[PDB]
Every structure is written in structure tokens, then in C-alpha cells.
Chain A
Amino acid sequence: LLNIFDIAGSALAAQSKRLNVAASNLANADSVTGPDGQPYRAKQVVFQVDAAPGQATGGVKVASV
């Protein structure tokens, strides 16, 4: 059941990443500029299945933001 530990840890990391993205978006609801002068474009995480050696079922990994 150590693979279950891998699954649960990966999923905790993914949900923490989503929560952080949402918090950063909520902070920047009214932001007008960044460092370069470009507008702040809202971020969204992409979830993907982490089952590379585990057939079609596995943990969830954040592919990109």
C-alpha cells in the first residue's frame, strides 16, 4: 500500500497547488499591472494522471500552469 502513499501524496500536492493558484488569483482580482507592465492574466493548473508505470490508474500530477 506504499503506492497508495505515493497516490495520496501526489494528490495532496496537486490540490495544494490548485489552492495556491486560486488564492493568487483572488489576490489579483483588482491588479492593474505587473513588473513588466503587462496585465495579470489569471492562472489555471492542469491536472493529468500520474500513472506512467501503473496502467490507467494512478495519482494526479500538475502538468502545467
Chain B
Amino acid sequence: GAQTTLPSGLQIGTGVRPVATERLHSQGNLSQTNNSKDVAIKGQGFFQ
């Protein structure tokens, strides 16, 4: 209403929904496997 007192007014919510789950693109650690076929990436890049 038009305004001491407390601002009257019933405002009711609905709930909670999940919008989107995001992945954290942070550089992981490197482990040593002597296999020469394995390579690790230092930076933001993806093999196609």
C-alpha cells in the first residue's frame, strides 16, 4: 500500500529449479606415464 510501520504485502514464492550445470575449466595436474603416446595440454585447447 501507500506508505512507523512495516511494508504490508503478501508476496509468495514458487520454489527452486536447476538452470544449468557448468564445468570449471581449470588446468589439472600432470601424471607421468612413460607411454610415449600420451600427451597433456598446458592451456585451453581440445583435440578434435
Residues of A within 8 A of B (CB): 32-33, 36-37
Does B4 reach chain A (CB closer than 8 Å)? yes
A36 to B6, CA, bound (A): 10
Q: Is the interface of B mostly helix, strand, loop or mixed?
A: loop
Contact size class for B? under 10
Residues of B within 8 A of A (CB): 4-6
Listed A/B pairs (7) with beta-carbon separation below 8 Å: A32-B6, A33-B5, A33-B6, A36-B5, A37-B4, A37-B5, A37-B6
Contacts of B5 in A (CB 8 A): 33, 36-37
A32 to B8, CA, bound (A): 11
Contacts of A33 in B (CB 8 A): 5-6
